[PDB]
Amino acid sequence: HHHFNLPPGNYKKPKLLYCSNGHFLRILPDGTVDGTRDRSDQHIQLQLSAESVGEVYIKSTTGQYLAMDTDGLLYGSQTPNEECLFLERLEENHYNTYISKKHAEKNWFVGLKKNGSCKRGPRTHYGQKAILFLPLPV
């Protein structure tokens, strides 16, 4: 029950998801998800892939998938499951945003705070800069 404005997107080469808050999304090997302003970090290289038109997976360099638990918390999973699917949509005509598929009706987006920590699903909404991402070349 959402719009269907899709972004160009590229699933062939890895990218660095940059947040409008000025942070890069990072997934550590131990499964911790957070944000960092260091462009030279080696845990921010991410790989995206299409599972359907509009649905995507966000995998890490080590082989972990970003996910969202029943409480709206983000974590890095070792194996893909129904919590690893995100609807990828265009926003503001230029940015990218990601909605949890399993919790789509509640509008739980992926976001980062200005201090570098993850936002919980229920705390996110249209109009905040924390949900606006931009995929850059590595």
From Swiss-Prot:
PROSITE patterns: HBGF_FGF. Changing residue 114 to E: Reduced integrin-binding. Defective in integrin-, heparin- and FGFR1-binding, and defective in inducing FGF1 signaling, cell proliferation and cell migration. Changing residue 119 to R: No effect on LRRC59-binding. One of its GO terms (cellular component) is extracellular region. Keywords: Acetylation, Angiogenesis, Cytoplasm, Developmental protein, Differentiation, Growth factor, Heparin-binding, Mitogen, Nucleus, Phosphoprotein, Secreted. GO terms for molecular function: fibroblast growth factor receptor binding; growth factor activity; heparin binding; integrin binding; S100 protein binding. It comes from the Eukaryota. The keyword Amino-acid biosynthesis does not apply. Pfam families: FGF (PF00167). Changing residue 37 to E: Dominant-negative mutant. Defective in integrin-binding and in ternary complex formation with integrin and FGFR1. No effect on heparin- and FGFR1-binding. Defective in inducing FGF1 signaling, cell proliferation and cell migration. Residues 113-129 are annotated as: Heparin-binding. A motif (Nuclear localization signal) lies at residues 12-15. Gene3D superfamilies: 2.80.10.50. Heparin binds at residue 21. Changing residue 117 to E: Decrease in LRRC59-binding. Monomer. Homodimer. Interacts with FGFR1, FGFR2, FGFR3 and FGFR4. Affinity between fibroblast growth factors (FGFs) and their receptors is increased by heparan sulfate glycosaminoglycans that function as coreceptors. Found in a complex with FGFBP1, FGF1 and FGF2. Interacts with FGFBP1. Part of a Cu(2+)-dependent multiprotein aggregate containing FGF1, S100A13 and SYT1. Interacts with SYT1. Interacts with S100A13. Interacts with LRRC59. Interacts with CSNKA, CSNKB and FIBP. While binding with LRRC59, CSNKA and FIBP seem mutually exclusive, CSNKB and FIBP may cooperatively interact with FGF1. Plays an important role in the regulation of cell survival, cell division, angiogenesis, cell differentiation and cell migration. Functions as a potent mitogen in vitro. Acts as a ligand for FGFR1 and integrins. Binds to FGFR1 in the presence of heparin leading to FGFR1 dimerization and activation via sequential autophosphorylation on tyrosine residues which act as docking sites for interacting proteins, leading to the activation of several signaling cascades. Binds to integrin ITGAV:ITGB3. This is Fibroblast growth factor 1. It comes from Homo sapiens (Human). The gene is FGF1.
